């Protein structure tokens, strides 16, 4: 057990959510931590704790309900918050982040009660440096930081986006281990453009439109200033739900000289790659044999294709052969060289051919081998682009990546249905799974975020890496791919149980460390004998620390009380 | 406003509720507090905190997840919560009091989430007094303790009864001003007798029987000489829901040595008395005049009977005869001399008799003017009672005090109708006003524990009195019966509205004060020239105080720094 | 100035000597921080506090007492501590070092009053990481352990030897601007051979022997283990006073595995040849073309010679002539080839020769260029030797290192005197001036170690330097000689002036750390363009901090408090 | 002996002339109250 010994005593430990066990203390520990009589006469296991929280989890009558019981958890005792998200992580994950936390930021001037996080804004330029003081951790190790601009699907919500930050984080230790003490959850709040909370009384953030400009990017670089000079260069710091202009500019500006990413941009294309790595021990063939299409051309369609990019490149094939396997398509047709409204972006897809509208008569024409829906336009994956892919293909990869499910291309019901049992399938959200007429069920998994972004911050952080390489990302989808089993793959799953992901995450940062040992980028020495047991060691546990005194004798000779 | 310079800072100044703010620190307050980015960039007035929190309360589905709610609230921002609870009391009393504390008792161990007050149990025999070096305020003026063994009639609550203890000083706060700070709830925990809760994996008590003879008297004993060694003679002491011959004893024992009372007899006996008083206006008679039958003989009506004896013998009557003007009736039926299954305290009432065990019966015998039911049983007030009652007098006064509606002896819809409106009525539990035949609408009111309590402990407190006599609660009878106007009479009602409760404290302890100070009881000198502002000057506000530092500058010449 | 935003306030900043301004805290910094009231009301400036202090050290009667005075000003008051030091380094590093911190010592127990520094026992074997944890300063970058068993001349003082890192460490600060708040001295108390402490009621360390063997040296395993692994393998631990074969054993165990030194053996080594490279700017010929004879052969000829070896290496001798350029003599005499009574470190030096025990007959076999005394025997260079010296060399060179006066080889007097004034003198104590017959003043240096210690500490963890090579004490060597300008050598100074050390050290660091970057040593990235600027960044200021919270406005329409 | 319990800790309890009893604080009051270490170790009586 664990080590941690406060200073602090009486009431104000138990306001200490790092410190405060609740009725986990036992007598001794209550009296000699001054505070025997402020708990109930009762000495509660962990799990007689857990067993209450989810006692009364269960009698409410929501999500929302449920996420703000958790919250209040997190807020008065944050290993017992631990321990009950991570003793089911398929259970709370969507409870304390997507999608409960999408209601829970459009709620969260409303229900605002305990504050996390650190607030920055635009009118304390020249002194986020003090406003970094009021934290009161000083080892930070990873920072989550949004502007509030582009919350999940949602848009802009302002402050009443630092909802992302801290769910974001509770997942970094649930899923990956990261130490909580450690970790910063930061809201940018430089304005907004939401109408109804520029209206709402109870609006918690700056009641003033978004500052642009370079006021907003000198800021942003004061920001980066101010807390790798407080915690060090080797401290993490990970861009959410920025607007897609700013996410790929800041992304650029700084990922060569920041411990930084971006995990809309590169943790997604990450994950899809992870499943397009699984799905081609079915098809059983190579990435260069694809022909890959994507409907949609926005953040996830270039960070992906980016990363496709590479993996082919890896296999030896180079950048404008690779370039060449690669279709998209916006929402005003096909990407082709000199059509109108093409951005510097989608300019790399765009080769010679027709301009094309229909996405039906797309897939005919471009016959795709991995048809890939990051558009955000439920249904598009129509009953004659299905049959049409089942046609051209003996196993089509089909991935349905718009969230909702109200918003996915196709549901899994649908894609088997039509292509006949034939189609490789994962989506965005959870679909149930999907018995074919044979009787074998097929169970379609998620290409969820939370299998990259935990693992790669354990890593870079447990090693010293400075920097996060294209590499790191590729390197992680490759390692998540070889977590499916053959066994997996046979049942449908292009992705390793949502149950293991505490073991998955294990394994991204081992390859991370071990990499970074041998390409000499790791900066923690001595090197350790054995990166598995190093890794494991940096991991935060669930089971309470002790926080006594340690206690222990002399010698009674040299113990005694000189007299004379 | 008032000062109280803090030296805390930092996020622990935020998690101190009698520090704690919100969002209504100023921005100078959060920079000058080091909490500068802790919180949202936001500034709210006091009433837009209320608003946040009533239309949070608004959404809510159940009286115990209101109380859930407004208990989250006085853990981190206890002006705000008073200031909640004072912007409407008439709402808000029966959420965070009785009723509904009733079921947050019985929920205790499975809802227990934030710990309040001091738990103390056998097991800290002869430890008490470092028990209470554990509670973070040093000045207490008020304590409320329970043994749970008798918590509403709910019965045998054990540790579970800290509900009533938290909730009951809550009022005395919010109904009389005592400042929340100087507030101490209790509970002694002994065991419990509650089968359910034995068995319960959940319960927050002792999991044992109670202990019960000398070593329960003996560690009440240290109790009371720890509290009062620490927190000095004038700190008061009230007793709260123990079983019946324990609060007789530890009364008697006790209210001559201590500053000390117990509500559940003396403070229900003083409202009682109130009623009575306020419907003798009505009758235009004495109290010499009456005769009282009493449904039930336990903790209220030994109580209420003594008081009236107490009142008989101050108009002038002797105590035999004054005792002779009343009739209990318990479980067994009338209360006569001689008869099986009499404690020491029924005897005093057992007049020479026929025995008799029906209560209709009963009523056609005794001819009560007043018929007051303590009993718990719910319809015992029958058709024929009350046509009884209403045949033998010209108003006959009606008290159906049992608790709740469901337990109550005649509805006031019943009352009426049988009395064709003659009836001077009133109850524990609220009804509605009832319109008669004739045009008249009556408003009947309720006995409330409220009327009593808060202002007591305000006056008992504020001049400092040792000890608090049957006077003191015999002259809060009158003031209450007061403070009704004769429109109120004419409306029906005995008590005076229940939104103006807090004007009603005031009036009791300006009594207590002015009394105190004429009979040289008072301790605390020098007298004030006016006991109305002086009063008013020790009642707590739901303002914030003012926590910065008192910042000033002195003359330049000597506030300049010297060098050469 | 500097920004150190504290949450500390009321009486208990004032105890803190980091935090404490006393008289110089103005009015505006006493209302912040809740301590108006607890100063006399007159606002000092810094100046003004150092005449109160100098004014109080200049009516003393003792060099002791003067210490007492300077270490209780530490205790109280830090930056004003240091402001003192340097305002006079010359006048003040004799009363907090060298050589009354001898006396300190010898006092320790009896004069005992407010502790400083860490004291581990052998008996906190296994528990030494708890010990780290009452120390209140979480970052450390600078650590000073003795054992006390070899405390200057004084030898075994056991736990009184805690005089000595407290004192160095203070050196380290004053002359090399290391921040005080991140160093920390430790003394290591396994017991003592002192018998007459072992006899003292007052001594204030363990009553018993020194543990000896495999105990003791794991002991020492544990502590560079707890250290390193608490504030990182970044953080510097030099080893002081502990006895020989000790000091070299554990340097030689640790130097390839921690941020480790022992000034005793390396700082001596790299003082002498500054000495002697800033001589050969006198002589005007190379090392190579010089003879060395050291009288004594301990830790300290031992030390030098291996790097005056080194220097030799260097300018472009092999190791084996190198050798040859040196000669020891010990207690038993020349050391020369198979020779009774050898150490293995000894023997390195132990030339093919005769056996000769009389310094004078040594010095007219060997005739030196050079002459350093290491012996303690204090007059050993006897009228004698110092005429050889003068007849074997225009300009011999001849240090008389050994502490104090009264141990030098000789004075400066006898030395200018018998050598007619063309010795090139320097001394390991201070002489005064020396009038020459023919009205020339000479002014002889001290090779202090002072020179040395506190600019290699500052540029290592500067640059972050993960190990400490003889390289960087020759370099360092070469850095102090080039610091001594042509009309110092001509006034017979080989030293920079005590009052300029700050910049010797600044220079020192420059150094190292220019190199660092150079040869990829360096762990602090990025790299700075001013190495510097960098530097002078690093090193702690005497000018008092400010700590009241950043207060600063935003707009009006922001800032506003919100109402409806 | 009269008990004071002190919610004071390490360093700062140390600089309180109230709580603090230099070489007086024994082993066990040492490693309590989160100071051991800040002392030389040897335990002295009043006297
Ligand atoms: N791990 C996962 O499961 C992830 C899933 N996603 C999902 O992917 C979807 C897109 O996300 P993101 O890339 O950030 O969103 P963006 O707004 O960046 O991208 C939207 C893209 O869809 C295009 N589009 C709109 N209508 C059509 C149409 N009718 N036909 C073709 N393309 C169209 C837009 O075209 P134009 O460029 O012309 O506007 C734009 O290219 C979202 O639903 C998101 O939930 C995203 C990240 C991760
Ligand atoms: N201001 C208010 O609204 C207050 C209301 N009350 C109400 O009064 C009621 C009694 O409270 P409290 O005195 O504390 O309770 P106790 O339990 O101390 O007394 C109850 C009494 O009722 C008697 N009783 C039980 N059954 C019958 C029966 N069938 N016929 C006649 N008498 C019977 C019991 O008899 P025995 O002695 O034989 O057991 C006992 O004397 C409760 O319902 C309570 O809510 C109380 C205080 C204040
Ligand atoms: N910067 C400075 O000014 C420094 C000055 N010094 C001074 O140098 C002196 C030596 O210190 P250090 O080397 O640590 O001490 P050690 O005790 O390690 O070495 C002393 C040496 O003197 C030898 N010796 C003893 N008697 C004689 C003798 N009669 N003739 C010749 N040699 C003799 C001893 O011989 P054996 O091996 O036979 O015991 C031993 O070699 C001290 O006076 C110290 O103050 C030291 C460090 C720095
Ligand atoms: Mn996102
Ligand atoms: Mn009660
Ligand atoms: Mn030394």
């Given at each position: 057990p664990?080590?941690?010994h406060?200073?602090?005593?009486?009431?104000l430990?138990?306001?200490?959510?790092?410190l405060n066990?609740?009725?986990?203390?036992?007598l001794?520990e209550?009296?000699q931590?001054?505070i025997?009589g402020?708990?109930?006469?009762?000495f509660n296991s962990?799990?007689?704790?857990?067993?209450?929280?989810?006692?009364?989890?269960?009698?409410l009558?929501?999500?929302?309900d449920?996420?703000?019981?958790l919250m209040?958890?997190?807020d008065?005792?944050?290993?017992?918050?631990?321990?009950?998200?991570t003793?089911?992580?398929?259970?709370?994950?969507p409870i304390?982040?997507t999608?409960?936390?999408?209601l829970?930021?459009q709620?969260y001037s409303l229900?605002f009660?305990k504050p996390?996080?650190?607030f920055?804004?635009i009118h304390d330029r020249?002194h986020?440096?003090?406003?970094?003081?009021?934290w009161?951790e000083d080892?930070i190790?990873?920072?989550?930081v949004?502007?509030?601009?582009r919350?999940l699907?949602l848009g802009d919500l302002?402050?009443?986006?630092?909802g992302?930050p801290?769910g974001?984080?509770?997942?970094?230790?649930?899923c990956?281990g990261?130490?909580?003490?450690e970790?910063?959850?930061?809201?940018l709040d430089?304005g907004?453009?939401?109408e109804?909370?520029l209206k709402?009384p109870?609006?918690?953030?700056?009641?003033?439109?978004?500052?642009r400009?370079?006021?907003?990017?000198?800021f942003?670089?004061?920001?980066?200033e101010?807390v790798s000079?407080?915690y060090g260069?080797?401290?993490?710091?990970?861009?959410?739900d920025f607007?897609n202009v700013?996410?790929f500019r800041?992304?650029?500006?700084?990922?060569?000289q920041?411990?930084?990413?971006?995990?809309?941009i590169?943790?997604?294309?990450s994950?899809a790659?992870?499943?397009?790595?699984?799905?081609?021990?079915?098809?059983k063939n190579?990435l260069?044999?694809?022909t890959?299409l994507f409907q949609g051309?926005?953040?996830?369609?270039?960070?992906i294709?980016?990363?496709?990019?590479?993996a082919?490149?890896?296999e030896?094939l180079?950048?404008e052969?690779?370039?060449?396997?690669?279709?998209?398509?916006?929402?005003?047709?096909?990407?082709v060289?000199?059509?109108?409204?093409?951005?510097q972006?989608?300019?790399?897809?765009?080769?010679?051919?027709?301009e094309?509208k229909?996405?039906?008569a797309?897939?005919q024409e471009?016959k795709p081998?991995a048809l890939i829906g990051?558009a955000?336009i439920?249904?598009?994956?129509?009953?004659?682009i299905?049959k049409?892919?089942a046609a051209?293909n003996?196993?089509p990869?089909?991935?349905?990546?718009?969230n909702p499910?109200?918003?996915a291309?196709?549901?899994?019901?649908?894609?088997?249905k039509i292509?006949?049992?034939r189609?490789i399938?994962?989506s965005?959200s959870?679909?149930?799974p999907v018995?074919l007429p044979?009787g074998?069920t097929?169970?379609?998994?998620?290409?969820?975020?939370?299998?990259?972004?935990?693992?790669?911050?354990?890593?870079?952080?447990?090693?010293?890496?400075?920097?996060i390489?294209d590499?790191?990302?590729?390197t992680?989808?490759?390692?998540i791919?070889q977590?499916?089993s053959?066994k997996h793959?046979e049942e449908?799953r292009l992705y390793?149980?949502?149950?293991t992901?505490?073991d998955?995450?294990?394994?991204?940062?081992?390859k991370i460390?071990?990499d970074?040992?041998?390409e000499?980028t790791?900066?923690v020495y001595?090197?350790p004998?054995?990166?598995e047991?190093?890794?494991?060691?940096?991991?935060?546990?669930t089971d309470?620390d002790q926080?006594?005194?340690?206690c222990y004798?002399?010698?009674?000779?040299?113990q005694?009380?000189?007299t004379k």
């Amino acid at each position: 057990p664990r080590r941690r010994h406060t200073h602090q005593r009486g009431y104000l430990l138990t306001r200490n959510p790092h410190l405060n066990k609740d009725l986990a203390f036992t007598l001794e520990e209550r009296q000699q931590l001054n505070i025997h009589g402020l708990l109930p006469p009762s000495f509660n296991s962990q799990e007689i704790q857990v067993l209450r929280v989810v006692k009364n989890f269960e009698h409410l009558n929501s999500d929302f309900d449920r996420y703000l019981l958790l919250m209040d958890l997190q807020d008065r005792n944050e290993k017992l918050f631990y321990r009950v998200l991570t003793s089911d992580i398929e259970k709370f994950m969507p409870i304390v982040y997507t999608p409960t936390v999408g209601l829970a930021c459009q709620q969260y001037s409303l229900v605002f009660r305990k504050p996390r996080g650190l607030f920055i804004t635009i009118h304390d330029r020249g002194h986020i440096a003090s406003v970094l003081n009021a934290w009161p951790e000083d080892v930070i190790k990873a920072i989550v930081v949004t502007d509030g601009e582009r919350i999940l699907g949602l848009g802009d919500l302002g402050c009443n986006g630092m909802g992302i930050p801290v769910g974001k984080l509770a997942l970094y230790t649930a899923c990956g281990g990261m130490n909580p003490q450690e970790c910063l959850p930061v809201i940018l709040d430089v304005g907004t453009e939401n109408e109804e909370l520029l209206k709402d009384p109870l609006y918690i953030g700056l009641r003033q439109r978004r500052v642009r400009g370079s006021e907003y990017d000198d800021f942003l670089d004061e920001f980066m200033e101010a807390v790798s000079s407080k915690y060090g260069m080797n401290c993490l710091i990970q861009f959410e739900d920025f607007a897609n202009v700013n996410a790929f500019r800041l992304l650029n500006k700084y990922r060569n000289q920041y411990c930084t990413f971006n995990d809309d941009i590169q943790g997604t294309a990450s994950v899809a790659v992870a499943g397009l790595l699984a799905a081609l021990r079915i098809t059983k063939n190579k990435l260069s044999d694809q022909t890959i299409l994507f409907q949609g051309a926005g953040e996830a369609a270039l960070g992906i294709a980016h990363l496709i990019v590479m993996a082919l490149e890896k296999e030896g094939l180079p950048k404008e052969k690779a370039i060449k396997k690669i279709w998209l398509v916006d929402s005003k047709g096909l990407i082709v060289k000199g059509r109108a409204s093409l951005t510097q972006e989608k300019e790399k897809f765009a080769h010679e051919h027709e301009e094309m509208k229909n996405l039906e008569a797309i897939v005919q024409e471009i016959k795709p081998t991995a048809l890939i829906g990051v558009a955000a336009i439920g249904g598009a994956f129509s009953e004659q682009i299905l049959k049409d892919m089942a046609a051209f293909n003996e196993r089509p990869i089909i991935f349905a990546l718009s969230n909702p499910t109200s918003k996915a291309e196709c549901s899994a019901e649908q894609c088997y249905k039509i292509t006949k049992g034939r189609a490789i399938f994962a989506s965005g959200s959870p679909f149930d799974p999907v018995t074919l007429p044979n009787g074998q069920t097929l169970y379609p998994g998620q290409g969820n975020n939370s299998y990259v972004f935990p693992g790669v911050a354990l890593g870079v952080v447990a090693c010293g890496l400075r920097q996060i390489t294209d590499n790191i990302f590729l390197t992680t989808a490759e390692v998540i791919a070889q977590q499916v089993s053959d066994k997996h793959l046979e049942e449908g799953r292009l992705y390793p149980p949502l149950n293991t992901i505490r073991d998955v995450s294990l394994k991204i940062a081992e390859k991370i460390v071990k990499d970074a040992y041998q390409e000499k980028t790791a900066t923690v020495y001595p090197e350790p004998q054995n990166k598995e047991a190093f890794v494991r060691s940096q991991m935060y546990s669930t089971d309470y620390d002790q926080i006594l005194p340690d206690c222990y004798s002399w010698p009674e000779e040299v113990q005694k009380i000189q007299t004379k």
